[PDB]
Design a protein around this ligand. Structure first.
Ligand SMILES: *SCCS(=O)(=O)O
Ligand SMILES: *SCCS(=O)(=O)O
Ligand SMILES: *SCCS(=O)(=O)O
Ligand SMILES: *SCCS(=O)(=O)O
Ligand SMILES: *SCCS(=O)(=O)O
Ligand SMILES: *SCCS(=O)(=O)O
Ligand SMILES: *SCCS(=O)(=O)O
Ligand SMILES: *SCCS(=O)(=O)O
Ligand SMILES: *SCCS(=O)(=O)O
Ligand SMILES: *SCCS(=O)(=O)O
Lengths: 166, 166, 166, 166, 166, 166, 166, 166, 166, 166
């Protein structure tokens, strides 16, 4: 657990699925933009992926405030792609507008203190990192409870307001 | 930082101001009830204490779901009392329905990983602890951004739903 | 890496997909039989899983000489199930008669000395464990090169011949 | 505790309330003058702050012999200000001519050996620091017993006599 | 050393000169009474021993409030006796009513944190110990400056008042 | 030991018997060619050396794919030469085309993790090393079971194919 | 190693060739008898084993004075047998009435302090051990220089006379 | 301590009483001269200082052979002076022509290995040091037994003759 | 050195020559009497052994005060005998009335702090041990300078007198 | 022990008796020739010194093969002389042609691993050092049993022959 508020967010890099393709992605790619970086447990469970979908549907509300969204699980990039290429009808994600980062080595998860050593995947963790790479907000949820796009928006808008008028 | 999701929330005890009086309070007093335990930086700043007030106004929405709310800063119990006995007109808290816990020794703050060694007070941290004493949720905000009573409610309701139907 | 020829094979347990269902599985369940226990890198890659298919399709050549086969990768059991439910025409596994063990936490791969720290998955490693639970054979292949069912059969038959005839 | 008679007094700096305003203050600002530097436990307690008032009210007996006085507790500068803006008729300090230094982080109290680990505040400790920045006198009192301005004057006058006459 | 306010005063024992005779003396002998225990630097110096005389002349004022007085230096008991047997006129102490404790080994001075490693004697240190053997007060003066019987009397009386009156 | 897949094979050197003569041999001599490097337990045992013979008879099949073969045991070079100079009829190896490396000091066996501390010799271990000196394959057999030239040939060919064809 | 004059000779055990057969042999088998215990470098070298031949051919000069002889090298027991089955005319040992002790593990050589770490065999070490198993003599020779049967007899005879006549 | 025969005598320096005055004195002041350096327990005891008196009264027997004498105890220089100003008739030293070295810190006594940790003074130690500052003699006596001026002279004379005549 | 005044003299034992005969001698044999224990450098040197002969000649003066005398050097007991058996004319000791203790191992000299590590023998050390085995006196002379019997008598008589008469 | 075959013989130096005279002798003085370096227990014992006399008598047989002989014990050089000067009739060595090296410090015996810590002397060790200072041979006899000059010649001639003729 290296993630500490008002300290630079721990650096990550890896392979993400972006618009159906493998792309290399790293935290510094988002420098100059605010980033919502969130973790979810696993691809292909029997629980509908409403969060990822929800952030995906409302991506323009983040893009209109100079904010990007990246989702991460410990699954491989190949699983992410397979999950994306599986139709929602069949319990897949369907096409998605948000990068799916793979944390196969588990190092990113550990560095963000969201890794569950017992399970080998993460809990539901969400991070708001500013345009300067500084961690501004940490949200950790026990597995069965998801996240509010509305509340993430409120938080992003609030830090940006604070940045300008403070 | 001992606070870990789905692990027992770190034990605390100390003096709180409750209904204008000094009372000893400890985490175990809340066993059997869900607890919203939150930290704020300092009493008597020039910023209106809207959060404490907001949780105070809407306390019955928590009590109707078997949930209590406790606020904490590193200020002494005496400061808390003085802040409470100072009218909102003059920048005080005014009377309040929520216990104000004092973390004078700073140990509670450290155990919850919300202490700022540089400042000697906390950031805005919020914790949702269940009826069995288990940490379910951790919310850490950089100083200038407050908390949503609505979002805390959503979270408490969600964990209780999960407790019954899961 | 605690796997040593002529020493008991490191104990392992985890969730496996056995005929489309999640079952807890352990090394000790194989006591009384020879076990071929092999690691492959990742589900859902763009290589045909010819080698896993081969062991599954020729499984009776193993069972008729008192031998089972168990496959393992670092993928979750949910990824394993989905891969199984992907037809071979689409580079999936199709239905399979061999258990697919999940090593999500990586402990089993590490105990077997097959984990790759920088990739987060295993290489191609195969282990032949006798009916007494003793490790008799270790085969470790760099990624691109697969394993022969005929060579595995030869080795199993030879240890068995060796067991019976002094 | 690094405070030693005839050694330089441990350096300190922090925010103080000086005539109703926040000013950064440091030990080195007192170079050239004697300094009486004393700790009291807590603002806003149910004891009249007779002892602080005494030093403030007789401040000229110190300034006319080249001596300043600085008070300190672990309270924040915001608590100090509020206490100052509480009239003596209501057990506040009323306006005061002596700086009230804040030791929020407790580092100054610890460096002076006056911090109480289990209470989170200091005891009653008073230090006489000469114009060369050297510690000449240490007075440490258990909580209930206060300090005499007359005794402090006597000690200051004696070190000064001693300084001039060999 | 080991002297801390509100902790038992560090135990000591040694030879003292009481009314012109060597007696074994210990801290525990004073249990049930308050004790003013002070250190002075050296016998036979070129300075008049005003402190020790003043405590001896006004002893009944301490005895009448259930308080004893013990003085101590690093000098041997033989030096103490000779100093007493030297008439005040000639730089001696003359007959005295206070015990003169010898701390030849330096251990007592070290335990009270008054020993000066480079000088081989103590600074001017004074300790107020209550009837239960708890240390209530620590006064440490740089060499040139002595102690006030009035002040000491005030502190003893204040601790006894606070003891009894709640 | 130090042998790891996709790392340079641990360096070795020693005396070998090549066409009936002692020659100094080293791993680096084989750079630019593939190398099958294998260990066998002991010369002069009561078992026919079928493995070593088979590799020697079919050597041209390795030479024609730019691959050399080296066999090794803990026996001395003198024992190797005598074993070669013993006719197969009488339990000897007879003339051979593969070098017989001596690992008298045991260091090579230890570096390859094939040494048996309680027996004083190796198990049956086989290593495939590429032309760049990188280790591609590790095969470790419990004592009774030998090695297949077909399998070895298959693995060499597969690594060379994958080398070239992307 | 641990071999020390007038201390018990370091225990050893292992497999030896005794009249064409493999027997387990230990130092304790020689209790009640003097033992000449010697090491030689290697079997099958290009020098006639005149040393070993001589002790064997002259064994009765030892047995008739209650003394046994054991030869040792790091060669395996199979190498020892092959060597014995090689005729003296052809460079071999021919039949021999002294056990050839195998030290494959090197432990015995190391306990006797005769092992050459750089070469992986022994120098020429001879040890005379009495009937109580106490080490009475150590003779260590650099490699090219052999031992004398007459000198060894003289020492044995001398030690026994010494035993008998005080 | 560090005092060793035929090694340089441990350096010392401190304040001594030399003809009624305080002088700083160091071991190096005696280079070019033999030095008799001795320790005695304490000033002002109830035994006449016959030892010290004797060396003082007989000093010319040392000076006429290029030898000086220094006496030391742990007493302060002020105690030494008082003692000197006490008449021999009254138990004191009377005037004395030998320096009385003060060892208040105890360091010198400890360097000479004569300090008694339990008593806080020295035993009776005498040291003969040559003109090059090399320690030639150590005489240590348990407390109740004094030194002989005739023996010390005989040793000094013996060391000088030895120096002169090889 | 382990010898320390007023502590038990380090235990010793060894072989002494007493009236031309080898006897085992121990420090404890002297319990109930005073012991003059002294070391000289070496037997058979060109210096006349005056000290040993002096103590020998005057032995009755010690025995009449219940005191024994033992002489020691690092020489073997055999050297002591030969030296005793060599006439003073031809550079020997001649018959002597004092035990000559051998410290061949050097351990006794080491315990007594008289051993010269660079020479392999002792300087001239003399020790006075009382009837309860407590060391009372340490005399260490640099090599050239011998010891006085008169001085040694004086010290013994002094220790015995102060033992008796308080 | 630091002596090791085929390593440089441990350096030694000391005082030897050579033709009745004290000379400083060093191992390096023997460079360019072979050296028989041997230890015996002690001078002046009741055992006839046959070994030393034998090597002495036959010294020309060594000198004609470019070989010197040095004898050592722990005795002082003075003891060696006296022993040499004592006629064989009266239990001495008598004139001898071989240097008698003194190892008074015991350091040479320790480096050679011949020192008996419990006796303070050596057992019977013999060492053959070549012309380049390399140790070629170690012979260690338990005390009673002496050494043979014929055997020692045989070994020297053997080492020199194998030095020359490859
Ligand atoms: S995945 C949950 C949404 S819906 O497809 O069931 O409508
Ligand atoms: S404290 C902010 C609310 S209001 O009093 O200004 O209305
Ligand atoms: S990816 C598997 C290829 S095939 O099954 O279509 O032959
Ligand atoms: S609390 C202060 C008491 S007074 O100022 O009213 O006298
Ligand atoms: S010695 C005390 C006498 S006075 O200095 O106070 O006059
Ligand atoms: S020694 C090899 C001959 S056979 O056993 O294969 O017949
Ligand atoms: S190894 C036999 C050779 S010879 O000495 O007998 O000639
Ligand atoms: S201290 C003087 C006493 S006496 O020996 O001179 O009698
Ligand atoms: S040691 C020489 C003195 S004397 O015995 O010969 O007199
Ligand atoms: S050492 C006794 C033998 S001999 O020299 O007396 O012949």
């Amino acid at each position: 657990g290296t993630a500490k508020i008002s300290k630079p967010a721990p650096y990550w890099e890896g392979t993400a699925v972006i618009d159906g393709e493998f792309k290399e992605l790293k935290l510094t790619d988002y420098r100059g933009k605010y980033l919502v970086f969130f973790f979810y447990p696993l691809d292909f469970t029997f629980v509908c992926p409403t969060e990822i979908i929800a952030f995906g549907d409302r991506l323009e509300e983040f893009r209109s405030i100079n904010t990007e969204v990246v989702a991460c699980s410990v699954d491989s990039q190949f699983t992410h792609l397979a999950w994306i290429n599986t139709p929602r009808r069949q319990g897949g994600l369907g096409p998605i507008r948000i990068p799916l980062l793979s944390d196969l080595t588990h190092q990113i998860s550990k560095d963000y203190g969201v890794y569950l050593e017992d399970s080998g995947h993460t809990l539901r963790g969400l991070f708001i990192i500013d345009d300067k790479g500084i961690l501004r907000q940490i949200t950790l949820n026990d597995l069965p409870v998801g996240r509010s796009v509305d509340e993430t928006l409120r938080l992003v808008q609030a830090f940006q307001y604070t940045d300008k008028h403070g």
